[PDB]
Design an enzyme around this catalytic site. Structure first.
Site, PDB file in Angstrom:
ATOM      1  N   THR A 253      38.572  49.527  34.579  1.00 48.74           N
ATOM      2  CA  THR A 253      38.581  49.038  33.205  1.00 48.74           C
ATOM      3  C   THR A 253      39.935  48.430  32.844  1.00 48.74           C
ATOM      4  O   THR A 253      40.008  47.479  32.067  1.00 48.74           O
ATOM      5  CB  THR A 253      38.244  50.158  32.212  1.00 48.74           C
ATOM      6  N   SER A 254      41.006  48.987  33.407  1.00 45.51           N
ATOM      7  CA  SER A 254      42.349  48.431  33.255  1.00 45.51           C
ATOM      8  C   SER A 254      43.067  48.581  34.588  1.00 45.51           C
ATOM      9  O   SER A 254      43.514  49.678  34.936  1.00 45.51           O
ATOM     10  CB  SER A 254      43.120  49.123  32.131  1.00 45.51           C
TER      11      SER A 254
END
Lengths: 195, 236, 238, 242, 133, 203, 229, 231, 215
Positions: A1-2
């Protein structure tokens, strides 16, 4: 996600969060998004978990065969294997993959492979849903030839902002440093980057 | 046609397998010994022609990270077997998620050799394979496979024309007392001295090729790393 | 025991491979010399003056950095070069880097050895000398019909292989520090001219190629023009 | 590189004999004396072990294998053929019976499958018969304890007490000399040990013979299986009371 | 020299018009014992020579009989099953390159159209009904 | 759905040393009845199989299981047991993972060796439901569940078990539009097997 | 294949009296996000061919690898691979069009619009277009995608018909191309300020200009616009 | 010989006797001569008939508007090879819109001939070929043997009694190379060269075929009354 | 359905509910959801019961074959890889969600696999329809210093919470304890807090109530 990868002066540092969500519910609060392909040349993946795990296993097997038969693979060889796997299954997988590696000749290399199977080198790479919130900041605070501590601080700040501003991103912050010394693992807890 | 294809003779023998066994002998001799936590293989690097590049003349292959293989016989079949073993080990690691044990790879190669000796359209390979490793569940391990599909593990082993002398010396040594040296350099020096005793010719640094299998990985020793043991052996 | 390809003799020999080696022995002389950086030289027999000069090229190029010569049955060498080109293209597609010379040698050796495992085929009747330059430097290799290959400082095969081997050994002994590129070309021309004496009563054409760092940018190029004429004059002078 | 070996390598002789099968039987006959005795509460399978080299570790190679938790096998003949056939039988016991009916196959059906596999080698193209004779010992709920012998021809026969190998005739005569109706597992083990000692030329200890038994139940080994391969120490202890 | 090991080309005619492999199999059967399996509830078979091939053929016959029962919801007539087995045995005597089967079969079966019947078959593929053995 | 085109009701209960299996007899195309003599309980040796759902699939499963049972008895020279038959049915149903038969099979019987009554049910893809009280299948499974949750006592005598299962089946069928047209009850004891037909309204 | 993910932008090209000029920007847009910069979309083949690709960039990399393989293959056993048996723009365009049509017929297209430009061995300028569906055509001025709607009208003001080609110098054509690029940067939301330009001339040869930038833009009048009434 | 039953067997001296028999099959064929210059290439073929009531078999096959061949030996093998060459030329003209080079066709034929001399179950071809063509590099003449050996020459001759024509071409090598402005002069040179191979025979309009290719000259065959003025 | 797995200092514990339903109707109230892949490796499954059972049986057969072939104890990682590859080959059409736990010569292992083949590791995991209540309980009462009894109590508490607070779970609790060096893992309904009360009236019909047409 990151997910992020930066090459500063002596190697490459890859950073990620640890949140895996099956919708609004957090399925895994602390997941290891950093996967080893070889001793060096290994980074993190985004997107669907099953496709990324399968691609990582296939790449690890292929590079094991390459090491056994023809010597030692480079970072670009792993990037090419990932590119082929993503491009031939373009309509079958949605992974998104950053590959980071170190070797004596080039001293740190990064390759980005988004949806569609294209590949780009770039000096630094960001990916995932949360990275959308850190495009400007990462552009305003990246310099070539940084030290290890400055790179750790930059990754920490960028990932903290991504965790804060993205709902589906952020547990602890995991970092992996690949240099001539070896492979180093680092973990940063919420009480550190939130303050 | 019982002497041309792998079919039984009237007395119940396969002559092609025996001919492959004969073909296993250039006449290089090789030795393998296991110690406390390591395994050592040594082979003769005979390059009488100065046109050849010495570094490319080798009969030792690193199959996987922990497994090494020394082959006695012609080099084309040796390379064929090495490639097959590497492929099998990589496939095993991918499919089962953990490193292939040395004895499992030896059994797989033995099954392949048996298949070669069972079908009439495939000739047996004329090579003898010795796999050495430090298995995570068994410690030092040496396993030898032959063109007949047979394979078995050894405390120590020797392959070549005059292997009987080496085997006799090794069995006498074991009757006297594995090797009780905790460092692999001592085991390498012991193997070199034993080979000199059995095959006395005062080997130089260019007449030997050494592979060492430790717990972390298997590797080979260069000529500069080879000449240090004989200097140490001489200075003792 | 000399009627099938994959039958062992009572002494463990394969006579079909030996007959293939005998067929190779009838081929023309081809040599290869490695320098510090490599150089390939071949003799082409002019059976008649009707042949058009410089139109029967024998040295072949694989990728942009591999040079190959062969002695024996020319169509077999061409088939092997086509297979090597296929393997190099597959490796380059799979890994994006030019195939290393040891990997190419291993691929060719595996192919040739597989051509000796069954009686439905026959072993190749050529011996190949091939080399080039990769990230690890300059490499030279020699492959035989049995499938065995080795790296060499200097290699030679054909009818006049013994004189060429003697000259190569003398050159290696006289140059412990290596050779340059132009000097290697001149030595290859001289060795070809000296090894041509096994025929004498037959005109011949010399073909030279080289592949080294500097003056070829790590690629394989044919030696043509003033350099080839200088090499020919040097060979004739000796 | 094409196979082009579709024709069969085993054919009938003018006298009605199959040459390859007879040659495989000849190869089997020059093997190691392996015997099997069926009792009222189990079946014992014993064999002798050879040493290829003094430096070779004998325990790395086992001449008796577990086919199913209740069925084991021994061989006389070519070892690699026995190993390949054991792997094939292990695969067949699952891919044909257990994955369909949820139970391990009975001994008779497994022996039939192995016999079919060995027969397929005597009629198909580009193959030779297996140079091994197999002894199968098993137990099933409905058939009790059973012992079978499978030949290279693919024909299997049930036996109450059988032996194969170089000393097959003498061992068979010894077994048939006194075979009662009240044989026990330990009595069968003692008789097998005596016969193996008589057949062997010497060096009759626990590390030169290999024995296995089928019977009773071993819940301690469940983690129970009816197949137990005796350790060297237990064999030595039994020989001390021989 | 691909494969010149063809064992006398099993499926060929002799100069006199005979089949050598079939005659040799008949000799092998004649050298065997003198003649117990159940194909279905109404048909039984006795075997002579090469019990393994006999078991294979018996399994094939059982499968064929059960297929007929499933298709027609009636027990298969004895003649149909005997003819199928004989055709299977004859197939190896004309093509395939394999050796013929070495089994002689004696079938005893009851159907609703003939009321108890007996047949015999040999490796040649010819089957004959007999009043008594 | 194909499981609600022809209709059908099958129930099975356990007794002291016996089992009982009951089924309906109606066969109709949607709302139009066709046949009143379509039994849904078949027998293999000493085991009983009651199938509900698409009638063609019921007949196909009956033929296939008769084939398999005959081959099994020929090979092993013994009659199949209810648990082995249950495993075989589950495996056969799972063989058609993507093309499953729209069936409601139920297996009942007494094991020859142990003598323990055994009843099991299955879904369309072969999931075993081994229940010691009762097993229910058909287009009126809820009614049978409501009738069998009460009125059922463990270790009932066969005489009382017959009345219990008959009342449950009749009252479940009376409230189902696609079931009826008679009812058949089997009481399976140690090699006894008694078959009876019930009296019910013709809707 | 079925939908593009990372897409390129317009490629423009025109013919002048002695050759061809082709230009394209260096953006790797990811929809509305300008994700990638510095992406070269003009692939030089030989000393006389330039291929401009617009659309999906993964397919662009695939076909540039195909072009590299074709160049490698043309040199095999070809002593005249650099003098007279060298590749030509016509051969490359025919191969590309065949590949595109074969991909279309299998319902697995390459989402690209391709312009092939160069000078033939006889001195004739070659400039042709292909895309998915295998549609091919030629014109004195060509443009793909968005530039087809804005760059073509301007370029056709200089080279309107065939007879105008001999009357156009290289300077005028280059100025027209630069002006068209500036207009495209004005009015295209997926455009970039930086672009590359290739000139193929029968006499001089191949001239490649990278890292060019749009300049002389007009924004002063925007100070006078306020509100919307 | 024990090494002659198949093509996958080497002799103790390293020879393939099946290939040698295929070569000998060429020697039992009619003589065909090929030559060329800077601008044109010419093939001259002498045809044969079964008897006086039969026609003369064709010996020249067109492969493409810029390339053709003449055969000596087994006609069906020549037909197979010509069909393969036509397919290759058509593929080159369709995919790349480029005229196939004669050397590329030579390499293709060499590879195809080699592939039939190494695998069990097949046989080598039994025909020799003289292939003429014109391309961007000029006029080319090639000689093809069933062993897979392809050579490039200014002039050559195959078939039976071919030594006379080859000797004439070698003697007059310096003359027919410069014949560029007159295709008919090159045809006359080819006819005079093939006349040296005649064994008590006379050239007629029935047994003479002449194929020519050139710069501004599509591959054109002359037979029958077309060759009246060249006799 | 509720399934939990908790890893203590030297082993793992797997617990599950025992209710299987089709739609809004309970099919079986005593279903077994703990599957034995290897004598020391146990798995529990949620989703399609038939798919889970078949996949577990196939992987167990392959694991047994591998153990026979290698003459070695099976490992949890081998079963994990086989299960995930098999599930990924079907692109999620085989709807099984698994929790695998075992003890091997390399230690104690606990993993979770999803229907698409993705796998994850952790010290405490929960799957099923009522997995959220069990996850909340685990987050509330978990510490890194756990003994055998503390883990076997935590698993029971999580399963009970999932049973009470989810309509898809009910009945009893099944437990399975794997520890390094011993078998154990023979619990089989440790807790049964769903005993039905006795009926108010007996409903046994007198004989002869049902009308019979023919016999």
């Amino acid at each position: 996600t990151s997910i992020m990868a930066v090459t500063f002066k002596d190697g490459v540092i890859l950073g990620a969060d640890s949140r895996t969500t099956t919708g609004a519910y957090i399925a895994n609060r602390v997941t290891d998004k950093l996967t080893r392909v070889h001793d060096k040349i290994w980074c993190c993946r985004s997107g669907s978990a099953a496709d990324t795990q399968a691609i990582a296993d296939i790449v690890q097997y292929h590079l094991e065969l390459y090491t056994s038969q023809y010597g030692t693979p480079s970072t670009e060889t792993a990037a090419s294997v990932f590119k082929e796997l993503c491009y031939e299954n373009k309509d079958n997988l949605t992974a998104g993959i950053i590959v980071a590696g170190y070797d004596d000749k080039n001293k740190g290399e990064v390759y980005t492979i988004p949806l569609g199977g294209s590949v780009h080198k770039l000096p630094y790479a960001i990916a995932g849903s949360g990275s959308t919130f850190i495009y400007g900041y990462c552009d305003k605070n990246f310099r070539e030839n940084m030290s290890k501590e400055e790179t750790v601080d930059f990754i920490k700040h960028s990932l903290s902002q991504a965790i804060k501003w993205d709902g589906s991103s952020g547990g602890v912050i995991r970092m992996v440093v690949l240099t001539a010394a070896g492979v180093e693992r680092l973990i940063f807890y919420p009480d550190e980057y939130e303050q | 046609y019982d002497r041309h294809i792998t079919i039984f003779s009237p007395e119940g023998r396969l002559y092609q397998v025996e001919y492959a066994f004969k073909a296993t002998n250039t006449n290089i001799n090789s030795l393998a010994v296991r110690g406390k936590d390591c395994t050592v293989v040594i082979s003769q690097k005979k390059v009488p022609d100065k046109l050849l590049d010495p570094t490319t003349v080798s009969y030792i292959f690193c199959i996987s990270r922990t497994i090494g293989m020394v082959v006695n016989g012609p080099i084309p079949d040796a390379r064929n077997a090495a490639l097959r073993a590497k492929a099998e080990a990589a496939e095993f690691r991918y499919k089962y998620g953990y490193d292939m044990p040395c004895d499992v790879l030896a059994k797989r190669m033995a099954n392949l050799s048996q298949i070669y000796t069972q079908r009439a359209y495939m000739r047996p390979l004329g090579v003898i394979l010795t796999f050495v490793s430090v298995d995570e569940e068994l410690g030092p391990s040496i396993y030898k496979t032959d063109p007949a599909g047979y394979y078995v593990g050894y405390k120590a082993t020797a392959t070549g024309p005059k292997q009987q002398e080496i085997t006799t010396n090794l069995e006498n040594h074991f009757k006297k007392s594995h090797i009780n040296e905790e460092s692999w350099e001592k085991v390498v020096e012991f193997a070199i001295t034993h080979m000199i005793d059995a095959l006395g010719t005062e080997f130089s640094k260019n007449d030997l090729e050494v592979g060492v299998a430790t717990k972390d990985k298997f590797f080979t020793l260069s000529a500069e790393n080879i000449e240090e043991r004989l200097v140490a052996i001489a200075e003792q | 025991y000399d009627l099938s390809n994959s039958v062992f003799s009572p002494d463990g020999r394969n006579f079909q491979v030996e007959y293939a080696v005998k067929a190779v022995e009838n081929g023309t002389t081809s040599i290869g010399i490695k320098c510090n950086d490599v150089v390939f030289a071949v003799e082409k027999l002019i059976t008649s003056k009707l042949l058009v000069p410089q139109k029967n090229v024998k040295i072949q190029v694989v990728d942009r950095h591999i040079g190959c010569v062969y002695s024996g049955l020319i169509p077999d060498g061409r088939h092997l070069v086509n297979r090597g080109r296929e393997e190099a293209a597959s490796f380059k597609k799979l890994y994006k880097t030019p195939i290393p010379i040891p990997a190419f040698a291993d691929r060719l050796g595996q192919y040739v050895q597989a051509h000796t495992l069954y009686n439905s085929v026959r072993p190749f009747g050529v011996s190949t000398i091939f080399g080039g330059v990769d990230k690890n430097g300059a490499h030279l290799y020699m492959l035989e019909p049995s499938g065995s290959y080795w790296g060499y400082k200097g290699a030679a095969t054909g009818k006049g292989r013994q004189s060429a081997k003697a000259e190569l050994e003398k050159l290696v002994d006289h140059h412990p520090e290596g050779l340059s590129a132009r000097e290697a070309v001149k030595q290859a021309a001289k060795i070809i001219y000296l090894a041509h004496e096994d025929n004498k009563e037959k005109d011949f054409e010399l073909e030279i190629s080289w592949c080294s760092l500097s003056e070829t940018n790590g690629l394989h190029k044919f030696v043509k023009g003033d350099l080839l004429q200088e090499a020919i004059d040097f060979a004739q002078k000796e | 590189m094409t196979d082009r070996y579709s024709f069969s390598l085993t054919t009938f002789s003018p006298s009605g004999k199959l040459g390859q099968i007879d040659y495989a039987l000849t190869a089997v006959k020059q093997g190691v004396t392996s015997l099997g005795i069926k009792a009222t509460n189990g079946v014992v399978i014993a064999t002798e072990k050879k040493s290829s080299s003094p430096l070779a570790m004998s325990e790395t190679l086992s001449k008796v294998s577990l086919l199913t938790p209740d069925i084991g096998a021994v061989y006389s003949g070519m070892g690699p053929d026995y190993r390949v056939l054991v792997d094939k039988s292990r695969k067949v016991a699952h891919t044909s019976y257990k994955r369909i009916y949820g139970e391990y196959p009975p001994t008779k059906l497994l022996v039939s499958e192995v016999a079919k596999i060995m027969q397929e080698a005597t009629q198909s193209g580009g193959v030779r018969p297996f140079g091994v004779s197999l002894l199968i010992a098993g137990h099933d709920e409905f058939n009790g304890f059973s012992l079978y012998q499978v030949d290279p021809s693919g024909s299997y026969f049930p036996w109450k007490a059988t032996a194969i190998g170089k000393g097959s005739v003498a061992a068979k005569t010894f077994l048939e000399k006194r075979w009662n109706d009240e044989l026990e597992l330990e009595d069968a083990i003692h008789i097998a040990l005596l016969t193996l000692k008589e057949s062997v030329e010497g060096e009759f200890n626990g590390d030169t013979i290999e024995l296995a038994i089928i019977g009773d139940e071993n819940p301690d080994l469940l983690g129970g299986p009816r197949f137990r391969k005796l350790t060297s120490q237990e064999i030595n202890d039994r020989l001390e009371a021989l | 020299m691909g494969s010149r090991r063809y064992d006398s080309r099993t499926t060929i005619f002799s100069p006199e018009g005979r089949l050598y492999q079939v005659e040799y199999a008949l000799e092998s059967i004649s050298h065997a014992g003198t003649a117990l399996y159940k194909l279905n509830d109404k048909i039984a078979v006795a075997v002579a020579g090469l019990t393994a091939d006999a078991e294979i053929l018996i399994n094939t016959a059982r499968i064929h009989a059960q297929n007929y029962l499933k298709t027609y919801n009636e027990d298969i007539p004895v003649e149909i099953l005997v003819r199928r087995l004989s055709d299977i045995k004859q197939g190896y005597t004309q093509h395939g390159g394999l050796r013929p089967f070495g089994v002689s079969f004696i079938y005893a079966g009851y159907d609703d159209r003939y009321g108890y019947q007996l047949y015999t078959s040999n490796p040649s593929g010819n089957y004959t009904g007999w009043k008594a053995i | 759905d194909p499981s609600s085109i022809n209709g059908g009701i099958v129930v099975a209960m356990t007794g002291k040393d016996c089992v009982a299996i009951a089924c309906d007899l109606r066969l109709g195309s949607q709302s139009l009845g066709v046949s009143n003599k379509f039994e849904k309980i078949f027998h293999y040796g000493h085991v009983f199989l009651g199938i509900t759902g698409l009638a063609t699939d019921v007949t196909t499963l009956n033929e296939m299981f008769r084939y398999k049972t005959n081959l099994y008895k020929l090979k092993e020279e013994r009659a199949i047991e209810p648990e082995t038959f249950t495993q075989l049915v589950s495996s056969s149903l799972y063989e058609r993972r993507f093309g499953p038969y729209f069936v409601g099979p139920v297996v009942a019987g007494i094991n020859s060796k142990s003598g323990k009554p055994f009843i099991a049910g299955f879904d369309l893809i072969g999931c075993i439901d081994e229940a010691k009280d009762f097993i229910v299948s058909g287009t009126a499974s809820d009614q049978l569940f409501g009738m069998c949750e009460s009125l059922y006592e463990p270790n009932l005598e066969p005489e009382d078990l017959f009345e219990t299962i008959s009342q449950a089946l009749l009252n479940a069928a009376d409230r189902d539009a696609l079931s009826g047209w008679g009812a058949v009850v089997y009481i399976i004891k140690k090699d006894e097997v008694v078959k009876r037909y019930l009296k019910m309204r013709q809707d | 294949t079925q939908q593009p993910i990372v897409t390129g932008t317009s490629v423009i090209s025109m013919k002048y009296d002695n050759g061809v000029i082709i230009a394209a920007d260096n953006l790797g847009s990811y929809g509305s996000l300008l994700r990638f910069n510095g992406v070269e979309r003009l692939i030089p083949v030989g000393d006389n061919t330039v291929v401009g690709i617009s659309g999906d960039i993964s397919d662009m990399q695939h076909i540039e690898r195909l072009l590299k393989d074709l160049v490698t293959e043309n040199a095999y056993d070809n002593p005249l691979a650099d003098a007279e048996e060298a590749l030509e723009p016509s051969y490359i365009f025919e191969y590309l069009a065949t590949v595109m049509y074969q991909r279309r017929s299998k319902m697995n297209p390459l989402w690209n619009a391709i312009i092939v430009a160069g000078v033939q061995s006889n001195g004739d300028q070659f400039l042709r277009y292909v895309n998915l569906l295998g549609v091919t055509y030629s014109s004195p001025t060509l443009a793909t995608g968005f530039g087809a709607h804005m760059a073509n009208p301007l370029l056709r003001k200089v080279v309107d018909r065939e007879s105008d080609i001999p009357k156009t110098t290289v300077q005028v054509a280059e100025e027209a191309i630069v002006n068209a690029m500036r207009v495209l940067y004005y009015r295209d939301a997926r455009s970039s300020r930086n672009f590359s330009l290739a000139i193929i001339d029968k006499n001089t040869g191949l001239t490649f200009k990278k890292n060019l930038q749009v300049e002389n833009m007009k924004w002063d009048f925007a100070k006078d616009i306020k509100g919307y009434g | 010989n024990n090494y002659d039953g198949d093509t996958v067997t080497f002799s103790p001296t390293g020879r393939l006797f099946q290939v040698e028999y295929a070569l000998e099959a060429i020697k039992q064929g009619s003589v065909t001569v090929g030559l060329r210059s800077n601008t044109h290439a010419v093939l001259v073929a002498l045809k044969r008939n079964a008897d006086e009531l039969s026609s003369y078999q064709k010996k020249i096959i067109k492969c493409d508007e810029h390339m053709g061949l003449s055969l000596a030996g087994l006609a069906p093998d020549a037909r197979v090879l010509s069909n393969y060459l036509r397919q290759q030329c058509n593929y080159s003209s369709l995919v790349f819109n480029r005229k196939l080079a004669v050397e590329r066709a030579g390499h293709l034929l060499c590879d195809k001939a080699q592939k039939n001399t190494q695998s069990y179950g097949g046989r080598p071809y039994g025909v020799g070929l003289l292939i003429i063509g014109y391309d961007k590099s000029g006029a080319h003449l090639l000689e093809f043997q069933p062993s897979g050996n392809v050579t490039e020459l200014y002039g050559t001759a195959i078939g039976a009694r071919s030594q006379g024509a080859k000797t004439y071409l070698e003697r007059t090598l310096d003359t027919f190379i410069k014949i560029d402005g007159n295709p008919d002069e090159l045809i006359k040179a080819g006819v005079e060269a093939i006349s040296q191979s005649l064994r008590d025979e006379s050239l007629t309009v029935d047994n003479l075929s002449i194929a020519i290719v050139g710069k501004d000259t599509p591959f054109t065959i002359y037979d029958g009354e077309a060759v009246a003025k060249y006799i | 359905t509720t399934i939990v797995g908790v890893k203590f200092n030297n082993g793992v514990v797997i617990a599950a509910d025992t209710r299987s339903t089709q739609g809004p109707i309970v099919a079986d109230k005593n279903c077994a959801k703990l599957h034995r892949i290897s004598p020391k490796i146990w798995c529990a499954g949620a989703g399609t019961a038939a798919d889970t059972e078949a996949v577990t049986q196939l992987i167990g057969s392959n694991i047994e074959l591998h153990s026979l072939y290698t003459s070695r104890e099976p490992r949890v990682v081998s079963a994990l890889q086989m299960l995930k590859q098999h599930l990924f080959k079907y692109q999620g059409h085989i709807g099984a969600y698994l929790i695998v736990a075992g003890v091997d010569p390399t230690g104690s292992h606990l993993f979770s696999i999803h229907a698409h083949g993705s796998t994850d590791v952790g010290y405490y995991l929960s799957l099923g329809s009522g997995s959220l209540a069990a996850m909340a309980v685990l987050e509330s009462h978990w510490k890194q210093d756990l003994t055998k009894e503390e883990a076997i109590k935590l698993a029971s508490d999580a399963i009970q919470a999932g049973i009470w607070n989810d309509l898809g779970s009910g009945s009893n609790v099944d437990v399975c304890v794997m520890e390094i060096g011993k078998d154990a893992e023979y619990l089989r309904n440790y807790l049964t807090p769903n005993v039905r009360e006795e009926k108010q009236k007996s409903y046994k019909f007198p004989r002869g109530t049902t009308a019979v047409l023919k016999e």
